[PDB]
Design an enzyme around this catalytic site. Structure first.
Site, PDB file in Angstrom:
ATOM      1  CG  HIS A 186     -74.891  47.651 -36.391  1.00 16.25           C
ATOM      2  ND1 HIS A 186     -75.537  47.671 -35.195  1.00 16.25           N
ATOM      3  CD2 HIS A 186     -74.447  49.093 -36.327  1.00 16.25           C
ATOM      4  CE1 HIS A 186     -75.292  48.845 -34.501  1.00 16.25           C
ATOM      5  NE2 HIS A 186     -74.495  49.811 -35.146  1.00 16.25           N
ATOM      6  CD  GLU A 187     -72.236  51.129 -38.955  1.00 12.72           C
ATOM      7  OE1 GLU A 187     -72.914  52.607 -39.176  1.00 12.72           O
ATOM      8  OE2 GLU A 187     -71.988  50.953 -38.062  1.00 12.72           O
ATOM      9  CG  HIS A 191     -76.848  52.896 -37.378  1.00 14.38           C
ATOM     10  ND1 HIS A 191     -77.831  53.013 -36.096  1.00 14.38           N
ATOM     11  CD2 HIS A 191     -75.607  52.554 -36.923  1.00 14.38           C
ATOM     12  CE1 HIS A 191     -76.987  52.631 -34.934  1.00 14.38           C
ATOM     13  NE2 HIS A 191     -75.920  52.453 -35.515  1.00 14.38           N
ATOM     14  CG  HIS A 227     -76.391  51.821 -30.921  1.00 13.52           C
ATOM     15  ND1 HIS A 227     -75.888  52.820 -30.647  1.00 13.52           N
ATOM     16  CD2 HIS A 227     -76.381  51.017 -32.059  1.00 13.52           C
ATOM     17  CE1 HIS A 227     -74.815  52.696 -31.550  1.00 13.52           C
ATOM     18  NE2 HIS A 227     -75.178  51.697 -32.312  1.00 13.52           N
TER      19      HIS A 227
HETATM   20  C1  LIG Z   1     -69.577  50.681 -32.274  1.00 11.95           C
HETATM   21  C2  LIG Z   1     -70.508  50.520 -33.515  1.00 11.95           C
HETATM   22  C3  LIG Z   1     -70.850  49.136 -34.223  1.00 11.95           C
HETATM   23  C4  LIG Z   1     -70.776  48.724 -35.612  1.00 11.95           C
HETATM   24  C5  LIG Z   1     -71.131  47.544 -36.172  1.00 11.95           C
HETATM   25  C6  LIG Z   1     -71.602  46.456 -35.386  1.00 11.95           C
HETATM   26  O1  LIG Z   1     -71.823  45.242 -35.703  1.00 11.95           O
HETATM   27  C7  LIG Z   1     -72.523  44.140 -34.983  1.00 11.95           C
HETATM   28  C8  LIG Z   1     -73.445  44.480 -34.216  1.00 11.95           C
HETATM   29  C9  LIG Z   1     -74.167  43.582 -33.317  1.00 11.95           C
HETATM   30  C10 LIG Z   1     -73.406  42.294 -33.423  1.00 11.95           C
HETATM   31  C11 LIG Z   1     -72.581  41.797 -34.218  1.00 11.95           C
HETATM   32  C12 LIG Z   1     -71.902  42.859 -34.895  1.00 11.95           C
HETATM   33  C13 LIG Z   1     -71.660  46.721 -33.762  1.00 11.95           C
HETATM   34  C14 LIG Z   1     -71.146  47.943 -33.529  1.00 11.95           C
HETATM   35  C15 LIG Z   1     -71.857  50.861 -33.301  1.00 11.95           C
HETATM   36  O2  LIG Z   1     -72.228  51.043 -32.205  1.00 11.95           O
HETATM   37  N1  LIG Z   1     -72.464  51.832 -34.274  1.00 11.95           N
HETATM   38  C16 LIG Z   1     -71.990  52.039 -35.411  1.00 11.95           C
HETATM   39  O3  LIG Z   1     -72.573  52.817 -36.116  1.00 11.95           O
HETATM   40  N2  LIG Z   1     -70.510  51.750 -35.691  1.00 11.95           N
HETATM   41  C17 LIG Z   1     -69.896  51.213 -34.643  1.00 11.95           C
HETATM   42  O4  LIG Z   1     -68.317  51.227 -34.853  1.00 11.95           O
HETATM   43 ZN   LIG Z   2     -74.515  51.540 -34.179  1.00 12.88          ZN
END
Ligand SMILES: CC1(c2ccc(Oc3ccccc3)cc2)C(=O)NC(=O)NC1=O
Ligand SMILES: [Zn+2]
Ligand SMILES: [Ca+2]
Ligand SMILES: [Ca+2]
Ligand SMILES: [Ca+2]
Ligand SMILES: [Zn+2]
Length: 168
Positions: free
Chosen positions: A119-120, A123, A129
């Protein structure tokens, strides 16, 4: 999917990354494995290629820290923010930081490092998002009943190919 304001994105496909330091929670080889897999998720659907550096300034500097750690967004202890990353660009842009007040795991038992890193990196590559509950870029952490099932959604693929194109 969403992009950042102004749609910043890398102006090249060969990117570098450096794992500056390591969490105490896992063996280094596991952290390396989780990071490589997170990058490959995005490499497989674009022309991007990631090259690992062991010193100097890579495009994406990955590091683990707690609380105040040198940017405007301090971490916050266990829970809440897990990590954060910057959109494409020079210096701190593109970098990814992991809150070492979390318990990092290789499974479902804690906060999955592969998952969060994947996920990071989204970004770091220019995706913000998503509104899609099944997207990797959806802002709600959830671990997985089996990680082997993991797959980028079509929303994530379309976001990332809109910026960089498909594999040549
Ligand atoms: C809240 C949050 C995050 C980070 C990793 C994530 O991993 C996932 C994402 C979707 C599904 C399962 C895990 C999800 C949210 C996010 O919104 N943005 C982020 O950069 N860090 C954060 O802590
Ligand atoms: Zn995020
Ligand atoms: Ca936290
Ligand atoms: Ca950077
Ligand atoms: Ca930790
Ligand atoms: Zn930070």
């Amino acid at each position: 999917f969403r992009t950042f304001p102004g749609i910043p994105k890398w102006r090249k496909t060969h990117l570098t990354y450096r794992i500056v330091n390591y969490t105490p929670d896992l063996p280094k080889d596991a952290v390396d494995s989780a990071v490589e897999k997170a990058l490959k998720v995005w490499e497989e659907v674009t022309p991007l290629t990631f090259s690992r550096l062991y010193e100097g300034e890579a495009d994406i500097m990955i590091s683990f820290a707690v609380r105040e750690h040198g940017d405007f967004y301090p971490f916050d202890g266990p829970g809440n923010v897990l990590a954060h990353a910057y959109a494409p660009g020079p210096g701190i842009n593109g970098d990814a930081h992991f809150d070492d007040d979390e318990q990092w795991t290789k499974d479902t038992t804690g906060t999955n490092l592969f998952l969060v890193a994947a996920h990071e990196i989204g970004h770091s590559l220019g995706l913000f998002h998503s509104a899609n509950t099944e997207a990797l870029m959806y802002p709600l952490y959830h671990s997985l009943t089996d990680l082997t099932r993991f797959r980028l959604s079509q929303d994530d693929i379309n976001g990332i190919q809109s910026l960089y194109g498909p594999p040549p």
